[PDB]
Design a protein around this ligand. Sequence first.
Ligand SMILES: *[C@@H]1O[C@H](CO)[C@@H](O[C@@H]2O[C@H](CO)[C@@H](O)[C@H](O)[C@H]2NC(C)=O)[C@H](O)[C@H]1NC(C)=O
Ligand SMILES: [Ca+2]
Ligand SMILES: [Ca+2]
Ligand SMILES: [Cu+]
Length: 278
Amino acid sequence: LAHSKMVPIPAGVFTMGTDDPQIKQDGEAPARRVTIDAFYMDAYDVSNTEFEKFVNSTGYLTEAEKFGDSFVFEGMLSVAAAPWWLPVKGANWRHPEGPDSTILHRPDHPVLHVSWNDAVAYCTWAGKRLPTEAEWEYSCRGGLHNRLFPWGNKLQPKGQHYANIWQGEFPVTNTGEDGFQGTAPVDAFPPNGYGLYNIVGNAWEWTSDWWTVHHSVEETLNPKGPPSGKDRVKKGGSYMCHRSYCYRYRCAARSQNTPDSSASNLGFRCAADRLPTM
Ligand SMILES: *[C@@H]1O[C@H](CO)[C@@H](O[C@@H]2O[C@H](CO)[C@@H](O)[C@H](O)[C@H]2NC(C)=O)[C@H](O)[C@H]1NC(C)=O
Ligand SMILES: [Ca+2]
Ligand SMILES: [Ca+2]
Ligand SMILES: [Cu+]
């Protein structure tokens, strides 16, 4: 009903990264103090319905539609990064598992198979932009200091699921214990302390930064990441994550993809310096 709404993220200083990295290769360390000016973040990932409004307005054809394929996780079927990633002809945001799938029953789920360029196009059409990695991580942390997750350090506080990830033995069995085998609606699960939904889990989220693993401990202000690179940074993990193989549903976690990449577990949310017209 208000799936394009934004929340005000307060100005502050926070610790980005961690001096106890869990995936050292990803440049989770070192911890560094970062100052972030107040800004606005979408409460929800961009949903199928919201992305359809954009396509209806602009006629935009996504990169996956133009290339004719996109990566799909083998477990959702009726150069790949792992054996469970398949390039599927005709998989795209409207057909998230391939040409015989549909989004008609999942309008409120995050849009998938959107590349970094597709995400920038949507956000700019919406009067917004992608968040930087630092803005994203600050927002994810939800006003808590040096915690694993938006809500704290326990995966299931009070015996409750707080995010949509994998349960069971990946990749053969997803039990769906948390209520969702694939994505959940963009407004599922509790919000974090800033009012954001599914900031970890559900779908990965593009950020504006180029990827590097080499970070300084210097204190910075509104950092934008390195000036060049080959891959853009994505954050937050997805419905596929599990501690056993891909422990990336932590705010400090991070991964990357080339900007023309797309996949069945990768979406985005927008940010803005000020509210767009309303
Ligand atoms: C995107 O555009 C399509 C096409 O106009 C919308 O689907 C139509 O919606 C009208 C009512 O507004 C229906 O009476 C038509 O029968 C629909 N046509 C088709 C071919 O499906 C669609 O709702 C729009 N999506 C969003 C999110 O606004
Ligand atoms: Ca799940
Ligand atoms: Ca997420
Ligand atoms: Cu993961």
